[PDB]
Design a protein around this ligand. Structure first.
Ligand SMILES: CCc1ccccc1NC(=O)CSc1nc2cccnc2[nH]1
Length: 123
């Protein structure tokens, strides 16, 4: 239901599907080891290119430290533990004009579902 514009650019647009756990110790902070589950489809074809659920291996990364796509950094730094969102990430905040191999053509709108499982205070 809740539609959040995450960039003034409109590039990252998040829809909350399940409100996260309320409180402070539940919202992750910059540089923390984030653990997420996600599904990535291409807006064009609705084809899944990646599913952490389907591989049963959650994705861990350090928030806002440039490890993942910019759409992901922005998106994840706006979530609560146990939040599920939909994020429409525009190619600029994704893989840009190059794209990324076969799965993802140049200039591709990305649709993720992202669940924030947990986070440690790591590096
Ligand atoms: C190579 C992908 C990668 C490498 C290092 C760190 C993060 C990622 N993936 C993402 O940021 C977003 S998720 C994702 N991005 C992808 C691109 C192609 C195929 N599968 C993908 N899954």
């Amino acid at each position: 239901f809740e539609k959040v514009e995450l960039t003034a650019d409109g590039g990252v647009i998040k829809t909350i599907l399940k409100k996260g756990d309320e409180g402070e110790e539940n919202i992750p902070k910059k540089g923390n080891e984030v653990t997420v589950h996600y599904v990535g489809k291409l807006e064009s074809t609705g084809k899944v290119f990646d599913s952490s659920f389907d591989r049963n291996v959650p994705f861990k990364f350090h928030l806002e430290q440039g490890e993942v796509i910019k759409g992901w950094d922005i998106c994840v730094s706006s979530m609560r533990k146990n939040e599920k969102c939909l994020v429409r990430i525009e190619s600029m905040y994704g893989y840009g004009d190059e794209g990324c191999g076969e799965s993802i053509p140049g200039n591709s709108v990305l649709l993720f579902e992202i669940e924030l499982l947990s986070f440690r205070e790591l590096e």
